Each structure stands twice: as C-alpha cells, then as structure tokens.
Amino acid sequence: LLRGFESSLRGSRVRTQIDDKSFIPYTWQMIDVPLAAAKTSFIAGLDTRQQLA
Amino acid sequence: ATSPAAVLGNTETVTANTATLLTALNIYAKNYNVLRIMSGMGGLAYAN
C-alpha cells in the first residue's frame, strides 16, 4: 500500500508513447467502396480538329 | 444625335455621332456537344 504504488516516473512520460503512434486509426472512417478513375479521352474529349476526316 | 429631325429623317447608310460609344464587340456561338456519363463519372465527348 505505501511503497508498492504505480507512480509515473520519468521515462514512463516519454513522448514516444504519443508520437510513434498514428492518428490514422482514430481519424479514418470505414469507406468500403471503389475509387474513381477514367481515361483522358473520356474526361477531356477527343481532339476533333486534328484528323483527316 | 441631339436633333431628332436629322436622326428620324435620314437614310440606310448613316447613324448618330453618339454611336462611337459601342466599343465592345460580342460574338457568340451556340454549339452541340455530347456529355458522356458512365460508372458514376462524366465528361465531354469533344474537346477543341
């Protein structure tokens, strides 16, 4: 009770316990769906002027 | 421009001296294009 108590001694207050951890498991939400992608000929368009016909 | 007898009493090839204020020329064209949309994404068919 008197000399068997769990004090925080320097070394146990070390900044690595907060710094080497990420915030990512705390800030990301589960998303569970596909990301967007498309070709240039679709998003931009066909160059219609540069052609024979 | 200040004499309506001269503005309302003249021919096809002339107008009023105050006409020189129409300094801005605006040329418009209305065209066709195609908006293609697939798989939740969209964009124009023709670019030029």
Is the CA virtual torsion A12, A14, A15, A21 positive or negative? negative
The residues with which B44 forms a beta bridge, in sequence order, are B35
Integer Cα distance of A47 and A40 in angstroms:
11
Interchain contact A49–B (C-beta under 8 A): yes
Q: Which residues contact A47 (CB under 8 A, 6 or more apart)?
A: B47, B48
Query: Which string of b and e fits B2-39 if b means at least 16 CB within 10 Å?
Result: eeeeeeeeeeeeeeeeeeeeeeeeeeeeeeeeeeeeee
Integer Cα distance of A39 and B47 in angstroms:
14
- Reduce the DSSP state of residue A16 to 3 states and report it: helix
- Chain B positions in Cβ-Cβ contact with residue A38 (cut-off 8 Å): 39, 41, 43
B14 in Cβ contact with B23 (< 8 Å): no
Report resolution (Å) to 1 decimal. Answer: 3.8
- Report the structure determination method: cryo-EM
Question: Residue for token digits 């000399």?
Answer: A3
DSSP letter, residue B4: H
Neighbours of A33 (CB within 10 A): 6
B46 in Cβ contact with B32 (< 8 Å): no
